[PDB]
Amino acid sequence: QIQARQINIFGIVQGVGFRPFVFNIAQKYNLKGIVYNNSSGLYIEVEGEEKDIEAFIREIKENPPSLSVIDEIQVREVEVKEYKDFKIVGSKEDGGFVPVSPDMGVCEDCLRELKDPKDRRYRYPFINCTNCGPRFSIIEDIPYDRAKTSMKVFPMCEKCSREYHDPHDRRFHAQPVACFDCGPSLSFVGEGCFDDEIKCVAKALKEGKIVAIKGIGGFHLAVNALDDEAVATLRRRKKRYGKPFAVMMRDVEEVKKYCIVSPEEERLLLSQRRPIVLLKKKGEKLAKGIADDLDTLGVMLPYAPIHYLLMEEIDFPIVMTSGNVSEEPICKDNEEALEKLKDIADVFLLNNRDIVNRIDDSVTSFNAGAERIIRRARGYAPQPILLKKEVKASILAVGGFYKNTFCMTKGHYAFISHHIGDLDNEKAFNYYIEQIERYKKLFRVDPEVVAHDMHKGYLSTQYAKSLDLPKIEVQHHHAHIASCMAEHNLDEKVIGIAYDGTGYGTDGNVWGAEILVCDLKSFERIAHLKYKPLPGNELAIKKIYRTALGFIFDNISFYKNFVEQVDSRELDIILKQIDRKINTAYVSSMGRFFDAVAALIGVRKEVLFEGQAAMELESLMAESEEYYEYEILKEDRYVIDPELILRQIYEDYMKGFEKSYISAKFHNTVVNFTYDLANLIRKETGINKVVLSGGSFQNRYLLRRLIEKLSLSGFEVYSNSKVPCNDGGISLGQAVIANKILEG
């Protein structure tokens, strides 16, 4: 017997080698039929053995082409039609852009040619073809063409030229084609070294030195991830970091030794997008100082020819952290890196190919049955987000402050930028401004309106106000909810749960623990945490014991052991400044709530970076169904007093309960009261769609447990997946809100 199916794939499917893929996996499972493009995405007709079609449907479902963004797959039964063969058939929809693709990791064919001793490009560190290599990182302008890339200064040799022009070659119109004879080459700076440049880097790593490596999107810093001393000297030389290091490993087998790797996680690792994937550790096997006191590790695989070559010369994982002092934009030019990283790196691996657009490594993960991206950069940007509704007019969304991205709309596309970083330094600002001009140029966008955060002290806000265009201001947490709404094409009233550290509220106070009823044009504040004073504002976020004190300010005597640990003079002044309202904001913030908890139970008195106590509190928790009592009090809106929950936490602490146990109980309390609020709002409003966004949802337990709880009570639950739930996704939300305000 023979079985026949008709398959529709909706989403971004062009420009990603999807059709040649379908053709190949057709010859694989020996199937007959056709594939072609349509307006919605792709059309497939397939017939053959029942075991081949279910597997075909699985390969498309489980490992589709890396650069594709599949939104929906539909399968219907159809009558057998007896096809002779399989064909890639054309359509009026053929040649459907996007003009600029993300940078791509080395493809399987280039890998095999890199490792083939008989191949002219054997060991060539800049090998690429039509299906891989640098794209965005070297592109100045459009249409995509060598002359409009940093490859224009290299004249092609004969051998590369005929490959480029041969329509049946895998390097046909491969713009950055190269070989040893005509292409870029590597250089080694530092101490003398006789060998080839990769071997030198291997030697330097082996000796416990820091190597600055020029990759695709910029420079990165590497040491031997098994060498405690080398990791320690990098920690000392950055000195202002604290953040965990990402690590590069040679293959999935090596990852499975250090981390838990599910199939979806393996798909993200092996993807040509090649991101860092945050993974659960399997027992401490790496050096101290990589990712201490945390149960997760960011792992990436090789992505450029240089890494594959490096991997056969070393037998240890390597730290691969951004090439910057502190946290400013990473270096991109040779001379810029040699100066900026002089006190960090011992040696450098350079090359003579300009990086035009610097772009950081992406950082992603898998949780609650979907990809949850933390930092959307190399391999993802500058691919647009697909919108169901055509945008009325072109909007520039300037984003926010932390982990900034900007966003431009045109047609059915939201062109969100790659991760820019914190807009709090000259270097970040230039990078930002510069890249706005580049995106405008690459995607032919001329913005008519500007959307910005309500906060007046953001560089992004100041920039918006400095432009000569109508301005729409957007509340921070509304933009979080909306950013998720854009992903899932929602355009109706939802229950929006916006939990994060901070964002300017419409009442003038800090928000970040809000339940909103909102659509794309407006919102209503329905619920938040009871305001507590944050004495010293910014300082209290580093010294989180101050946040604790702010939360417990009207009930100091209850927390005897904790308050007696604080210097008496400081305590007096902290308590007086709250009374006199000096340098003190009032906050409704999930990030601060967590910080207070962390401080009270001796996890952390002071943090090296924002969110450290939040991440550690999550890592140390035990398995527990238990939780703390809470009262939902109805005032002007629905409010919960965090101090009443802190009371019980401190009690448990004083009785000698484990931090692991208390952390778990706290996590369940937030989940439980949030669920209870969501039910109250649904009961009043009739709204059954819930959106979860804001940085707090980077917490795996929080997101997972809440999606489960709400789904099991009939909620239709949505959270970020294509853009981050952190401030990296804000711009997308700003854009869709601005569009909706214009529309009517």
Binding site listing for Fe(3+): 476, 480, 500, 727
Provide the minimum distance between the beta carbon of 484 and Fe ion in the complex, in angstroms, as a whole number: 12
Instruction: Estimate the crossing angle of helix 642-654 against helix 544-551, to 10 degrees.
Output: 110
**Smaller CB distance to Zn ion: residue 130 or 509?**
130
- Distances from the Cα of 162 to the Cα of 62, 168, 181, 318, 376, angstroms: 37, 11, 14, 39, 37
Q: Does 111 bind Zn ion (CB under 5 A)?
A: no
For Fe ion, which stretch binds (CB under 5 A), given 232-240, 281-289, 493-501, 668-676?
493-501
Point out the catalytic residue in the list 5, 8, 19, 700.
19
Site size for Zn ion (CB under 5 A):
10
**Smaller CB distance to Fe ion: residue 175 or 698?**
698
Q: Does the annotation count 19 as an active-site position?
A: yes
- Distances from the Cα of 670 to the Cα of 140, 493, 719, 725, angstroms: 48, 24, 17, 18
Helix H or strand E encompassing 351: strand 347-351
- Strand 407-410 relative to strand 413-416: parallel, antiparallel, unpaired? antiparallel
Instruction: Estimate the crossing angle of helix 730-743 against helix 476-487, to 10 degrees.
Output: 90
Q: Does 514 bind Fe ion (CB under 5 A)?
A: no
Binding-site member from 132, 355, 497, 607 for Zn ion (CB under 5 A): 132
**Smaller CB distance to Zn ion: residue 130 or 624?**
130
**Smaller CB distance to Zn ion: residue 179 or 338?**
179
Binding site listing: 107, 110, 129, 132, 157, 160, 179, 182, 322, 360, 476, 480, 500, 727
Q: Does the annotation count 37 as an active-site position?
A: yes
Contacts to Fe ion from residues 132-191, by CB under 5 A: none
- Partner whose binding site includes residue 680, from Zn ion, Fe ion, none (CB under 5 to 8 Å by kind): none
User: Tokens 């509190």 map to which residue?
Assistant: 617
- Distances from the Cα of 631 to the Cα of 12, 89, 116, 679, angstroms: 47, 63, 68, 15
For Zn ion, which stretch binds (CB under 5 A), given 80-88, 105-113, 205-213, 616-624?
105-113
What b-and-e string marks burial along 364-378, b requiring 16 or more CB atoms within 10 Å of the CB? bbbbbebbbbbbbbb
**Smaller CB distance to Fe ion: residue 513 or 706?**
513
- Partner whose binding site includes residue 510, from Zn ion, Fe ion, none (CB under 5 to 8 Å by kind): none
Binding-site member from 9, 12, 67, 129 for Zn ion (CB under 5 A): 129
- Strand 716-719 relative to strand 689-693: parallel, antiparallel, unpaired? parallel
**Burial label, 629 (beta-carbon count in 10 A; 0-12, 13-18, 19+):** exposed
- Partner whose binding site includes residue 189, from Fe ion, Zn ion, none (CB under 5 to 8 Å by kind): none
Please work out, in degrees rounded to the nearest 5, the angle formed at the alpha carbon of residue 14 by the alpha carbons of 13 and 18: 65
Q: Which residue is nearest to Fe ion (CB)?
A: 500
Helix H or strand E encompassing 278: strand 276-280
Binding site listing for Zn(2+): 107, 110, 129, 132, 157, 160, 179, 182
Provide the minimum distance between the beta carbon of 262 and Fe ion in the complex, in angstroms, as a whole number: 28
Rounded to an integer, what distance in angstroms lies between the CA atom of residue 222 and that of residue 213? 7
Point out the catalytic residue in the list 24, 30, 37, 267.
37
Contacts to Zn ion from residues 167-226, by CB under 5 A: 179, 181-182
Give the bridge partners for 448, in sequence order: none
Instruction: Estimate the crossing angle of helix 590-600 against helix 612-620, to 10 degrees.
Output: 60
Q: Give the number of residues written for the chain.
A: 744
Q: Does 500 bind Fe ion (CB under 5 A)?
A: yes
Binding site listing for Mg(2+): 322, 360
Rounded to an integer, what distance in angstroms lies between the CA atom of residue 357 and that of residue 140? 8
Q: Does 513 bind Zn ion (CB under 5 A)?
A: no
Q: Does 107 bind Zn ion (CB under 5 A)?
A: yes
For Fe ion, which stretch binds (CB under 5 A), given 17-25, 101-109, 670-678, 726-734?
726-734
For Fe ion, which stretch binds (CB under 5 A), given 49-57, 302-310, 492-500, 679-687?
492-500
Provide the minimum distance between the beta carbon of 730 and Fe ion in the complex, in angstroms, as a whole number: 6
- Partner whose binding site includes residue 743, from Fe ion, Zn ion, none (CB under 5 to 8 Å by kind): none
Contacts to Zn ion from residues 661-700, by CB under 5 A: none
**Burial label, 444 (beta-carbon count in 10 A; 0-12, 13-18, 19+):** exposed
Binding-site member from 727, 728, 729, 735 for Fe ion (CB under 5 A): 727
For Fe ion, which stretch binds (CB under 5 A), given 56-64, 443-451, 541-549, 721-729?
721-729
Rounded to an integer, what distance in angstroms lies between the CA atom of residue 212 and that of residue 414? 34
Rounded to an integer, what distance in angstroms lies between the CA atom of residue 430 and that of residue 415? 19
Q: Which residues bind Fe ion (CB under 5 A)?
A: 500, 503, 727
Q: Which residues bind Zn ion (CB under 5 A)?
A: 107, 110, 129, 131-132, 157, 160, 179, 181-182
Supply the residues annotated as catalytic: 19, 37
